[PDB]
């Protein structure tokens, strides 16, 4: 009875206007987005009218701040529901995220992942349309510590921020390696410098055989290894809100931002896969991932899709018109630098970073078709971001032509093969997932 | 011709009123402070009327926020110049530090160490009195990353924050230990997870024989060791502002907040001693340190005093009326907790943390007498904070009685002995430094 | 692949509504402007809702302030990118230019040439359209000293203002004339009045054989002459921003406001020609000039056009409804004057100033067609401003009829002849530049 279509996309790092060019492929991408019931993208840029202060985010590539008019470029492109939890939503601080919320509400744009407190950032947003409703939840596993939102106490208010998916990594080492680490701790004098913390806490905070040194936790194992696990608090809370959202919407979509790689850059972290499985277990109809500037595999779990990374639907980092002083300080210069020259020198004039490689300039828009919560179709539309084009022209999305779409679909199928995912391929280069239903 | 007296003190963590009790010793402390030309303390608490949001500062003991009325308790006690750079000035964020600046300016209280940008936080404050002027500069080596203030760029404004004294620690390890660390990096799979960062940067960011892993830098040495060094940028900038301040004031006082211990908790970090020597080299008349909840040694360098830690002149952490939710979460509870019960359970009802030990409840107020920039006197006044008293009564300062003052002066002399500092002792328990001039 | 069209125009001094009349020629001008990708004009009037205070600008013809509704008359006419640097943007002071920026941003009108500081006034504005992007930079060589914008210092903010192109003029005189000037300096007693400036500076500021007297710099030469040179700071900075803008846009257009005449009123100043050559050397695709109330020549330099003066696309000075007191004081009167009567007496009731002469009421709209940065077409559309019409009807633009367009095109060709520019002429009176590409 209820038939709904949802368009998904990755990170949207838009800093300029004219997002949809006069190219018929870009206009067809816009027609595809406008033709669905819900089009979801994840705003990875702070829309600003001036409120806030730049935070030091050199580990995230610098501050990504743009004129608020870019919001109109998003909605006019066809997107209607925004996920806002990522490692850049706090680039202008708490004042910046409050201003972003104000801007989004003034334009009637439903959003999730950020709030005035932790609860508001964890809540789903309900987008209602004549055909039905979609609940969007947004979280991020990549962010600077302290940027997560906080709930109030009886005496103090909360803190504006993002919806966090924290995780801990543990280094498994052999007993001999462990004892060598303890010997390094003792002989260097590092242990001595915990003496006060010994007498105040009563015991060494490094001994919990487990160990904690250099801001990293080690554990004795038969063979060396590396494991990651989700924060139980965040996992349980996000799952609780997913279970809540299923009661109030036809479709529940969980968006997660995660740069964390697995054993190889193409594979997600183990904690992320556990998290996506948990989200589908609690009743989510789809899990859309992003973070990396490239595509990752697609997995069908309990007849629901998991897109571990859809890459970037928009990529205009080097075109931002506002570079902070701490970002400028990353490049030694004999004279003051303009933003474009700064970004040119930052990549060695295109010889480093994401420009020289092709996998960083392809993306994918999945269009999912559900009938009463059952996934009946999952079309895949490859997107070209303009690899090799000038910096001012690359990063704008368009439906890839047949050849490039076939190459992108091959990449996606290869990345999805370890999960047992199969893809039917159309003559135009688009495709769709093989379903069991 | 110009004769000036300056009273120094450590961290002032005031959260309640009635700072100066009806005890004649406390009133005599107030008379001592009011009797000098300048009385300097370092405000380690956010005075608030409601502006800002609590930041996660569990590593600093939680948020320390107090009613702005406590400012009147400081000035009425005799203090007239405030240093504000410490690990708690940003407990309410950038909005909180802006509100603190507004409150201090509305009450006519000169302050330094915080500003709307990095320059404003680095500037000295000039306190003018009929007898002459004092320039105060305030910085801190202990703070959460990102809390330092930032200067504007051509496109973006700065960021409100504190005046930073950053520093880096290096672990010297033998070549065999170094190779074991590299083997741990490789065999655990940690190196594999840098693969992307390898292809984007062109080289491994862990190889700079030096090494960088687990957020810590290691270097091959003949014998294991541990070294600390000041950030060259911060050292040079603070020295430049000290040289600037000498041109515009009779006396220049540099206040530094530093929890960092040396080989033993009583000794300062090597970087801190280098910093104090540099400050006196650039023309500072005194360097007053704080951070630890206990006293550290006193050193005479080029006939100028360096108080590495004056402890706390006020210590009312457990009496704060505003505990954040993230601070409450540090204590498991079967029911919601009130602030006092939270602090009681936080210390195991007085069996842990700073309460059981005496060195945490003594302090020192030095009164320095300069004549045309030459240190002619340096009286030491021991301060009792009420060890063993109830939690609501301990932490308020008073001039210690003869016995306790003698014990405190003995402690200070023992802590100062490695620097060659000698102290003459009065019959009342007070004393003064032996000078060469 | 990339094909873009840009419409250019001169100064837009609009003070009334109904800018596009019901005349089919005016509607065809509007259709021409709306039909291009970018239509650039230079707003020479302060749009005001009441913010600011009139500055004394009697040397610029008085204050030119208009109701902000005139902005809607500009955009509805077809213009989409505004240059704002001219000798009238500061007619309401710094508050006035801030209000103008607010008004332009509220209406979504891209602008350049003014900012809250010097950098913001020097930045290009990027207008994005489905077919591509255009970068506009705006500066002015005519303005009251002090009206240029200023950048902040570590202690003080900047100053809102215009983007300046300063220049210095030097009078070459023979050695005998030079010595006569020095003798006039000495014998009149003018040199004596520099005595204090002699003892404070250490040397006479008039002796730098060069000389500086009467606010003018003289230099000994074999034959008397007159030279002008650009300010090196402004030239280098504007060129730097042009080089920056080329990296981020398909087309870069530099708009310059300059009243300064050369040896004859029809010829530009030497500094202006050097500046335009420099702009094209740095990568500008076109240089559009304005300032004089008449047309100047067109020059093709390195296959890029330089329009030294496009005159006025709108000229409604005498129709302004707000005349300042200092402007009223320019006309002696027996009774208080209304604005229209003031402007009538100011021109001797049409017998003086710009009204009696025809070259002041013709203009030109060039439509340039670029293909991947290469100029492929440059159509010229003569514009009639209504010479001889009543004052309330003249100044509104319309496409000139065949006869008047032929006369205007002849004028433009004659003014362009010294630069080697040739023009093909259509049957309707319009034309296009002869290109080498
Ligand atoms: Ca990201
Ligand atoms: Ca502290
Ligand atoms: Ca003018």
Residue numbers in the entry:
A (entry chain A), B (entry chain A), C (entry chain A): 1 to 208, 211 to 439
Question: What text appears in the publication on this structure?
Answer:
MslH, encoded in the MS-271 biosynthetic gene cluster (msl), catalyzes the epimerization at the Cα center of the MslA C-terminal Trp21, leading to epi-MslA. Herein, based on X-ray crystallographic studies in association with MslA core peptide analogues, we show that MslH is a metallo-dependent peptide epimerase with a calcineurin-like fold.
The in vitro experiment revealed that all variants lacked epimerase activity, indicating that the four residues are crucial for catalysis. In contrast, the loss of catalytic activity of the His295N and Asp11A variants could be due to a structural collapse of the metal-binding and substrate-binding sites, caused by a breakdown of the hydrogen bonding network between six-coordination motif and Asp11/His295 via the w2 water molecule and substrate. The His295N substitution had no effect on the active center organization, while the Asp11A substitution led to the flexibility of His295 in the MslH Asp11A:apo crystal structure, where a 1:1 alternative state was observed for the His295 residue. Moreover, the comparison of the MslH His295N:apo structure with the MslH:MslA Trp21G complex structure showed that the distance between the Cα center of MslA Gly21 and Oδ of Asn295 atom is 4.5 Å, which is longer than that (3.4 Å) in the MslH:MslA Trp21G structure. These observations suggested that the Asp11 and His295 residues would play important roles in maintaining the appropriate catalytic state of MslH.
